[PDB]
Amino acid sequence: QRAMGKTADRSLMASGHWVKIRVDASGVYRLTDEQLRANGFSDPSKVGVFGYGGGVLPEDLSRITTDDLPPVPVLRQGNALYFYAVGPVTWFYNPAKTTMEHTVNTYSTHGYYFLSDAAGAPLQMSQYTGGGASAEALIDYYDELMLHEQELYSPKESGRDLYGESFSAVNTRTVKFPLRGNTRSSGELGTVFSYIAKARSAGGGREMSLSANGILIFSDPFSMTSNEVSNSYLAGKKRRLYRSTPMNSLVNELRLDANYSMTGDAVNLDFIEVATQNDLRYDGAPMHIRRFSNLPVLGGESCRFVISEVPESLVVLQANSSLTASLVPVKTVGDKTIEFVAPPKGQDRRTINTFYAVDLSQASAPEILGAVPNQNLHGEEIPDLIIVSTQALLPEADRLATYRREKNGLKVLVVLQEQVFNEFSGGTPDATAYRLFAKMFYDRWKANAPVGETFPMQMLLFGDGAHDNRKVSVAWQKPYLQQTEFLLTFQAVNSTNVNSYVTDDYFGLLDDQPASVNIGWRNYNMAVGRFPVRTPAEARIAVDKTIRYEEDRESGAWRIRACFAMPVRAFQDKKKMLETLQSGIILLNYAGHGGPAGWSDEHLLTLNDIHNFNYKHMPIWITATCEEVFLHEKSGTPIMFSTTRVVYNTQNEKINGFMLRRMFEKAKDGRYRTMGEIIRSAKQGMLSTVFPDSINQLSFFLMGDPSVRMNLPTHKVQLTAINGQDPEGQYGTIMLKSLERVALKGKVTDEKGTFDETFSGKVFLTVFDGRKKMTALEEEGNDLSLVYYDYPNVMYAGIAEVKDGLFETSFIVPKDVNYSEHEGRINLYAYNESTKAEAMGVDFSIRVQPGIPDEVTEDNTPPEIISCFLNDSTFRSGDEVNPTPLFMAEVFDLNGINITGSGVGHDITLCIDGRADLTYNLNAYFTSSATDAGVGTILFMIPALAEGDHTARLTVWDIFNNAVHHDFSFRVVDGIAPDVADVILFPNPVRESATFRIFHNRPGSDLNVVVEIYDFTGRLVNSLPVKTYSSSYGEPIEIKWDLTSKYGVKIGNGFYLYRCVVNSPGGQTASMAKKMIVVAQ
Amino acid sequence: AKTTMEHTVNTYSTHGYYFLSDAAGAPLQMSQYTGGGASAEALIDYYDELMLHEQELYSPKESGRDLYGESFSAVNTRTVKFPLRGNTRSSGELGTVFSYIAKARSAGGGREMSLS
């Protein structure tokens, strides 16, 4: 049909009991009913075996015909079931060398399977059908394969392979193979001897020689040039010697003696495969009967096999795999002698069929690892992001997931790599399991996806990866390194293990392209990114860095602030200048070779060790314009692009990175593309144009969350007039005077600076009288501890409506600090409520000037009572209130309210029923507005008053002695008003910590109150909860705040909105939002 | 002050290290105790056997040099059994130093740590 497309809508693992088991050797294993009952299988009759085993999945996806959990055929005796398991070593036929060769599973040390009742019943094994009717030959022996292989050393560069025993010190190493009963005394001894060698000196009489039981098999000459010895990357010549040697008297043990003639060289044995000619006779041990040597028949032609000494508790399975195991129907031909007819080799002339003869009385249990929870990855909806995590790292992964789900609004799926292996490789670790899991969604998406649209999903490998995936090499032997779980690494091995590069791009190759297309030339369908973190501490740091990046809105305005002109100019080859504004340069990080050959191999074991994780050196350049284009490096983006291999151009010119002329072009959604997609399209574009520049074929790592967007504004806020003057291009030019009403006007534009009439919502803006500057407190001591005058005074802070791209507001300059030289600062942040889009701007055109001391006796205008309420904002004079009302009043005088104390009746006072008995000095309850010049606020809890009508007068005086009165009435009704509270922030602006003092109307009573903080986009930063009690005695409550967000990250500088809510039983009463400015973050 | 003896855990080591060596030439021979006074102002019928329950489980970095043990976050009651040995007297004064740390998650409330 061109591809496979039977991805199940629901996994088998979604229900029933599941128990993971494993093997370390191919053979028949057995599970008794007692063992099954003992592992939770209430009814053992319903249990079946599932999975693939060891032996890797094909990288040619078309060859994978199965999906979800494949049922394994099983033989069932009385109170036990049997199945043929497959270990990590598996063998294939090489028609050139007319022999069989082995293959070690790079990802696993074992073949994992599953036991489950979910089935309803086991898949009963069937009779073998391929057994031909007529045999073209009667066979007297089969080929017994054996394999000596020590996975000791792992040179990162060489390949996917590990190497064994060294001949550096020991010039002769002996390997003994046990020869088993049915081995023939005399016959041809087939041997594949694989080793690697790098000479320490040039030329010389160097030779690797093998002799079995004293008979010399071969003597291989080895040599190297002065330039080959002098090279660092050469790192050894791999050699594989095939050969059949007629041998005599091979009976109990086969002693192989490998000798390298020279001491001091870097020479290691990889493995020895040994193939003996054995009789078809049961020798008290199961036998994998295979026949390829001296074949007297053609591919697909049948042969009569006759085994003697069989115990008849023995069966013969034709088992090339676990999923294809079939019971060979035999016939008895004599005492303990059975016969069957079958093809030793397939009709394809590339397959050697395996006939496993085994005495089922001797079969024993596999390794029962235990029960596994139900799962259903197959039934998941197509997410935006897939986070594949290790166990330890899971809550830190889920934290990032929750952040992405909440802030970025997107479907994110978190899974454990174990889970992926369970549903995509029958529980066995395999790099292809990741790829298949992704492919499941890709295929699903493609079905209904419109023509032209690219696959939107992304994958985040939340974990570090080891080059030696099995952690079997000597360097890995160490409990931390051992007991840590890593994600798999995929190593793109080229033709005949010449070179190899480790890559995560493999996981994003989900198309149904043909097998002729190598891993290098296939289409990168899905963006993949990795956080090479080992421990949760590492992980939290990564996630915190990624979260804080998106939230620090002020870091993104620094790249937009570059309008004053490591700025390197790029020499390349109105509408032309517009394309260069959207351009960007990514520079590759080149992970070096820090160690003298052997060090690197013993100490640089994982991706993290190689590509040093801590996002390092200038990675992303933005090309800016006011030939040679000027480009600047901006904002510490969590992402890092890393390679080890170096890449050159025409005539060895080293490639430092790439430039995307359309990097910062916004998508249909009006947002920039995610780094993941930017890189994906980039990567995809390098193979798409590898016809003109064939020499290069670079692969690099996206180390970071692929869902990260460059913190760079989509829209900018631009002031157009300040007190009538045009501020664009001006620095400390527009003069503002103390107590002067300043009128502001501005617009909202796109990133290119074009006016955006579609932008309509609110704009938040804070005005400082100067700039933050380091100040050293001097003295006649050489040491001078220093601060930041982190109090450029806030002149004004407020919100304004933005209609059809524009806005206008005004404010009064406070009578405050103007000794500051140079410019002031206006921060602006706009939010378009409908598109949820954010705009930002910074202006330095204002400069404050000295307020001359004239018209000082002019303030004859008394303070203005802006508002004066009890409990709620909806209070008219004479309304029904409770015996302890919460008195709130906003007040205003241009020259300030007198809090001084004493000096006749100059105090702020509340005199209930014109009696000294009930006259309250409210100087201690007044809090001057840090945000609105001349404004102040009184907040007091009126002590208990008796039921009935009452009257009260608020009197407030200013510094210039002018007074004002405000009379109002209220009826006290016992238990009528709702519960409500208000809060004041001390200090404001906020530097390091914030304190919230809450006042309420129900004293001496418990109440659920909470202080809520919001950002200019309206999103809740956090909700600090508090409980009052009988122990307060009508005293306000205080809350200290460390400025940490709901995601456990410190908030950045900016305009926030604080308020408090009282969670009563019958409803929830909130207070008025109040401006909060943060400055020392 | 508390007219009792208190313990102290070596923060840097789990063991007491020593050395064996012939370098000496001969061992330092232990001497007889001299401080044993000629006349006794009292004949005593018992001594103070000290025991110590201490689990070094949690290490709040801020708090101190000390590690803390068993939590009462989930389990509200934790029992500790000390073996009492032969020469322990059936009846007598039971001296106890009980050290714990506590941060409330809500204000006020009837919270009490009780030993029995």
Ligand SMILES: [Ca+2]
């Ligand atoms: Ca190997």
Ligand SMILES: [Ca+2]
């Ligand atoms: Ca006045």
Ligand SMILES: [Ca+2]
């Ligand atoms: Ca302790």
